Structure formats: C-alpha cells, structure tokens
Structure 1
Amino acid sequence: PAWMRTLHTTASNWLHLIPQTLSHLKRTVENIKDPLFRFFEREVKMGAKLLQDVRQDLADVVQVCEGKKKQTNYLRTLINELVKGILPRSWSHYTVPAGMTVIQWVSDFSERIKQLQNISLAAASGGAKELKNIHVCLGGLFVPEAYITATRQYVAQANSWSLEELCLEVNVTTSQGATLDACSFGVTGLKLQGATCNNNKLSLSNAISTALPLTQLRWVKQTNTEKKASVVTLPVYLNFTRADLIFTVDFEIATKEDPRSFYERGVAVLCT
C-alpha cells in the first residue's frame, strides 16, 4: 500500500534526523556530592533511555516496512498511531504540549538530545566545576524545576547556607556581555510575552513575544525586606499552552508603568 511506503519514508527521515546515541555521565564520589552533577546524570539517563527506545522503535518500524518483521500488538498500535499522525503514548515521557504532532515532537526530541550530548561532552571534558558553567535552555530539559532545585542546592552547599533562606534573583543580560558569578547560572531560551525587558527593567509593548538573550538565576540570602511597589511577579510556564508552572520570577517595571496592567495583559515568561 502507498501508506506503507510513506511510513517507510518518514521513518527513515526521522532515523536520519534524530542523533545516534547518548553518553552517560561517569560516576564519581566527588561528583556524587555535587547536586548539579546528580541532576544532569538523571537527565542524561532518562534522555538516553528514551532515545534508545525511540531508535529501536524506528528500526522495528522500518524493518516492518521492508516486510521482514510481523506487526506485533505494540507495533500495530504504534503504526496506527503513526499513520493517524498523533503522538504515540510510549514515546512521550516528559511533559509535552497537547496539540503538538509527531513531526514537531521528533524535532524537539532531536534538539533536546543535541543539548544533552553537548552537556555530557562538557561534563566529561571537565567536571562539576565546568558543569556549573553551562548555559542550559529550560525548555530543552525534561524537568526544568529539577534544574532550579539543583541550582538552589549547589548555591546552598557551596556557601554552607540553608535551602529555605535562599531567594531567586533574575538578571537579564546579553550572552556576550554577561558575568558568571559563583551564585549565577546561565539560562537561555526564555521568551517574554506581552512586555520587553531592557537593563532588567520591564516595559509594556505590543510585540507578541520578546526573546530574552540570557537569563541569569542568582540565589542570594533572604534580605527580609518588603518588595518595592515597582516589582512584579511573573509566572514562568513551560510551553505556550501555559499548563505547567515552573517557577516565578521577580522583575522591576519601568517608571510610570502600572503592575495591574501587567497582570491584566497576561504577561508571562515561557521556556519554549
């Protein structure tokens, strides 16, 4: 049948597109002590398992397409799901937008695996100290809130502080013109919608979304001071559907601006 050939073509295309393999992080006691290493090792393990599953999936589908394999029950529901163009249930292990089709999911998975490969290569080249200095897209990660928690743990353990007494400061600077403080972590890919941020100062704009160049998460000791009237708390959603709440940032609005207008207009920060 024609659909059989089309499925063969798309499976071969995706097999070509998706990277080959993912390398696990080498275990070490000093690395075990570091929390960032633990989080990134968990992410690498999950990503590698999912990548192996998807690759073996595509290989089995291609082999069925040649005709040397019989369609088992799992393969049959798999092929039905593929031809109907919806996301397979087994493939989707991390939180995903509801309406995203298979092709977009495969492209996103390829991007995530590329980021994970870069992260693993950087970790292997150096160690936890180099692992702290990696600019990581929150959308690319499977569990970004785990990354936020890992950064908090690293800051607390480095300076012998308690976790509960640390608060989050966000500094939005360009990638080139950024300073990597011991308590600062580079985060890329955050998109600001409904407003534009300049010199860490929010301004209301009619643009659909403004891309933040490089968001720096700085954990500082709780100053125990009331927040100023010109500060605004913005949600950070995982995707455009706004179904996942990763964390809340605090930004300083510009002069003459009204935070109530920021709340009404649905200004938010998106990982993707």
Structure 2
Amino acid sequence: SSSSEDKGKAKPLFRCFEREISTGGKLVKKITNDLANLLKWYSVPETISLSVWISDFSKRMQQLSEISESVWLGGLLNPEAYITATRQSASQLNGRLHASASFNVKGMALEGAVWNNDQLTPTDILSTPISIATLTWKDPIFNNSSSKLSVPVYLNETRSELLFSIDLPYDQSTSKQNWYQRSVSISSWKSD
C-alpha cells in the first residue's frame, strides 16, 4: 500500500562508464516500470533496510548522471571493472597500485584508524571517511615496504570482496603486531 506508492517518487575508461550508464539505465527503466505495474544488479550488504537500499540506489543513479555530461568508487555498479580499467588507461599513458597518469577516488573510509600526519594512527572511532586519494600503478618504491602496513580495500563493511590492496605508512609508535590485530581496512562503500 503505502510502501510502494512511496518508493515511486524517488525513481579505456569511457569504455567503462559506457557500461555503467548503459547498465544503470536498463535498471532505471527496469525498476521504474516494474513498480508502476503493481498498481540487486550490483553488490550491497546482506542485511540493509529497504528505505536505505532505495535511498542509496537513488544516490547512485545521480552519481551516474554527473558522469554523463563530464568518482564515487564504492557507488559505481562494477567497482572491480573501473579499476581493471584504470589499470590499462593509467597504463595507456605512462606504463602494482600505490597511494598518496593516476586517478583519484572519494567515498572511501578508514576502518579502525584515522589519517594524521601522512600516516595511519590509532582511534576511538570504528571508521572515518576519506575525502580523496591518489593511486598510481607502478612496476620502484615497494622496497621500503617492511616499514609500511598493508591495508585492504573492500567493496564494503562486510569485508567480503576485495577490490585491491594498498600499502600505507603507520604511526611506528605502536607495534606492527598491535596493528596487525587491529585489522585496519578500507571500505569503498559506507552507509550513513
């Protein structure tokens, strides 16, 4: 009754977005009409309320639009792809990922840590958002890697789909063991 009536009012890179836009649309239309009738073409957390799926869904299609006229990584429909893409594009120019001919992402979050003084350091928060980051594919630097911490970037909280892995320096004041058990990770998608 009330539930459906509601939802209704809310309804080597170009290669990539082409499929996003494309795919999004098909889903736009698909769900657009499928509802009208009555009267997960992408990955998201097991449990997650309907209102949020919709709320988030709606925000993703907009993400989509802003892309047409022309990057919320964990908001795209195929994050894996966008990356495997940038691999070649970022490669089609200059050419192992690395953070800081390279792209920039926003919408990610630090889980179990915070970034103070160009490094990972302890916190009382379960997770804090990252406004943006620069990644670059290398071949060069990954040599001083025994003094840095490997932080995995998962599609989302569940920690069940790894997009890629990124190396970062950490507040050496704490043990490398204290860190390994802290289990810091990065979610590319965080709800609010």
- Tell me, yes or no, whether TM beats 0.5: yes
| Code of the aligned partner of 1:194 | G
Are 1:145 and 2:80 matched, yes or no? yes
Cα shift at 1:57: 1.1
In structure 2, stretches of 5+ residues that fail to align are none
Are 1:168 and 2:101 matched, yes or no? no
Counterpart for residue 93 of structure 1: 41
Runs of at least 4 residues off by over 6 Å: none
Counterpart for residue 93 of structure 2: 158
Are 1:56 and 2:33 matched, yes or no? yes
Distance 1:265 1:225, change over 3 A: closer
Cα shift at 1:170: 1.1
Q: For 1:200-241, what per-residue CA distance to the aligned partner results, in whole angstroms no more than 9, with x for missing partners?
A: 311122211111111112223x21752433211111111111
Q: Is the 8 A contact 1:230 1:254 kept in 2?
A: no
Counterpart for residue 20 of structure 2: 43
In the aligned structure 2, how far is the partner of 1:15 from the partner of 1:55? Answer: 8
The alignment partner of 2:90 has SS state of helix
TM (normalized to structure 1)? 0.66
In the aligned structure 1, how far is the partner of 2:61 from the partner of 2:159? Answer: 24
Q: For 1:172-201, what per-residue CA distance to the aligned partner results, in whole angstroms no more than 9, with x for missing partners?
A: xxxxxxxxxxx2212001110111113431
| Partner of residue 3 from structure 2, selected from 10, 15, 31 | 10
Distance 1:186 1:199, change over 3 A: farther
| Code of the aligned partner of 1:108 | D
Are 1:212 and 2:160 matched, yes or no? no
The alignment partner of 2:77 has SS state of coil
Select the structure with the greater relative contact order (CA < 8 A; seq sep ≥ 6).
2
TM (normalized to structure 2)? 0.91
Structure exhibiting the larger radius of gyration computed from Cα positions: 1
The alignment partner of 2:74 has SS state of coil
Identify the range of structure 1 (199-208 vs 261-270) with the bigger mean alpha-carbon deviation: 199-208
In the aligned structure 2, how far is the partner of 1:50 from the partner of 1:186? Answer: 27
The alignment partner of 1:226 has SS state of coil
| Code of the aligned partner of 2:48 | M
Q: How many residues align?
A: 189
Q: Cα RMSD over matched residues?
A: 1.6
The alignment partner of 2:45 has SS state of coil
The alignment partner of 1:100 has SS state of coil
In structure 1, stretches of 5+ residues that fail to align are 1-6, 19-34, 64-91, 123-135, 162-166, 172-182
Counterpart for residue 175 of structure 2: 258
The alignment partner of 2:42 has SS state of coil
| Code of the aligned partner of 2:60 | R
